[PDB]
Amino acid sequence: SVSAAPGQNVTISCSGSSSNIGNNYVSWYQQLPGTAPKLLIYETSGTSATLGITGLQTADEADYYCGTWESSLLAGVFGGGTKLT
Amino acid sequence: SVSAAPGQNVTISCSGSSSNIGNNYVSWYQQLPGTAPKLLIYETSGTSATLGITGLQTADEADYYCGTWESSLLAGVFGGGTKLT
Amino acid sequence: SVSAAPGQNVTISCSGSSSNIGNNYVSWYQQLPGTAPKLLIYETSGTSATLGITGLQTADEADYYCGTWESSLLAGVFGGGTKLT
Amino acid sequence: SVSAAPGQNVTISCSGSSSNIGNNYVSWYQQLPGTAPKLLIYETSGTSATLGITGLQTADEADYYCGTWESSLLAGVFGGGTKLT
Amino acid sequence: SVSAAPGQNVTISCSGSSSNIGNNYVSWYQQLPGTAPKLLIYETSGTSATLGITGLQTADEADYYCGTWESSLLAGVFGGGTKLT
Amino acid sequence: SVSAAPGQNVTISCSGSSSNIGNNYVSWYQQLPGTAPKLLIYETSGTSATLGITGLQTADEADYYCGTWESSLLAGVFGGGTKLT
Amino acid sequence: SVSAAPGQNVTISCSGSSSNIGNNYVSWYQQLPGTAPKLLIYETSGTSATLGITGLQTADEADYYCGTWESSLLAGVFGGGTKLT
């Protein structure tokens, strides 16, 4: 006879990509419970200006902040075929 | 005889892509319960200006902030075929 | 007879990619429970300007901050085919 | 008869890629519980300017800070085919 | 009869890639519990400027700081085909 | 009869890649518990400028600091095909 | 009858790659517990400038500091095909 009485008080605060918390696998027989690996198989005239949290062609996880991002300017981007006198 | 009495007080606050919290798999026999891996198989004259949280061609997760983003300007983007005198 | 009475008070704060916390595998027989490895199989005229947390072609994890990011400028990006007099 | 009464008060603060904390594997027989290795199999005219936490083609983990990042400028990126008089 | 009464008060603060903390493997028979090795099998005209925590083509772990990063400038990146008079 | 009453008050502060802390393997029979070796099998006209904590093609561990990184400049990177008069 | 009552007050502060602390292997029979060796099998016109903690193609461990890194400059990197008058 198997008996379980789990109690999990979980608090997740400002944690984006969290995974597999507070899980209870109770049984009389169990093969490969909780199988959650993280496998990664990585095979391998423009004037641009970028500011802030940016992704271009990624497969990456959650990008965030918990707080304040203060005033940003990006003041002046004079590029291709431009002429000033 | 299997007996379970789970109790999970879960609190998720400002956590975007969270996954697999507070799950209870109770049985007399169980094969591969809770299978949730994260597999990634990655095979491989314009004047632009960008400000803020930006994604262009990604397959990435939730991008966010919990707080304040203050005044931003992007004041002045004079590019292609432009003429000033 | 197997008996378990787990109690887990978990607190995750400002921790993005956390994984496999507070999990309870109770049984009378169990093969390979909790299988969660991290396997990585890595096989191998533009003027650009970038500011901030940036990913271009990655398969990387959550990028974040818990605090304040103060005023940034990126003031002046004069590149391709530009002329000034 | 197997008996277990675990109690884990866990606190994770500003720790991104944490893994396998507070896990309880209770049974009468158990083969290879908690299998979570970290295997890595690594086989092997533009003017650019970058500031901040950056990833380009990586498969790396969570990059973050817990604190303040102060004002940054990236003031002046005059590159390809540019002319000034 | 096996009896266990673990109690683990764990605190992880500003520790990114931590692993395998506070885990309890209780049983009457157990083969290779807690198998978590770290195996690494490593087989082997642009003007660039970079500032900050940067990864280009790595498979490395979490890169972070717990504190303050003060104002950085990257003021002046005049490279490919540039002309000044 | 095996009896165990572990108690581990663990504190990890500013320690990134820590591993295998506070783990309790209790049983009546156990083969190769706690197998966690670290095996490493290592087989073997651009003007660049880099500042800060940087990885290019590594499989290395967590790189971080716990404190303050003060103002850095990288002021002046004039390289490929550049002309000044 | 085997009896154990371990108590480990562990404190790890500013120690990155620490391993195998405060682990308790209690049983009536145990073969090769705590097997964690560190095996290493090592078989064997650009102007560059680098500042800070840097890894290029390594499989090395956590690189960090616990303190302050003061203002660094990298002021002036004039290399490939450059001309000044």
Author numbering:
A (entry chain F), B (entry chain G), C (entry chain E), D (entry chain D), E (entry chain C), F (entry chain B), ...: 9 to 52, 68 to 108
Paper lines:
Potential drivers of amyloid formation in this disease are post-translational modifications (PTMs) and the mutational changes that are inserted into the LCs by somatic hypermutation. Here we present the cryo electron microscopy (cryo-EM) structure of an ex vivo λ1-AL amyloid fibril whose deposits disrupt the ordered cardiomyocyte structure in the heart. The fibril protein contains six mutational changes compared to the germ line and three PTMs (disulfide bond, N-glycosylation and pyroglutamylation).
The fibril consists of a single protofilament (C1 symmetry). The handedness of the fibrils in this sample was determined by platinum side-shadowing, which showed a left-handed twist. For residues Gln1–Pro8, Asp53–Lys67, and Val109–Ser118, which are present in the fibril as shown by mass spectrometry (MS) (see below), no well-defined density could be discerned in our map, suggesting that they are structurally disordered. The fibril quaternary structure is stabilized by an interlocking of the protomers in the direction of the z-axis that is caused by a 14-Å height change of the fibril protein backbone. The carbohydrate can be seen as extra density within our 3D map that could not be assigned to the polypeptide chain (red star).
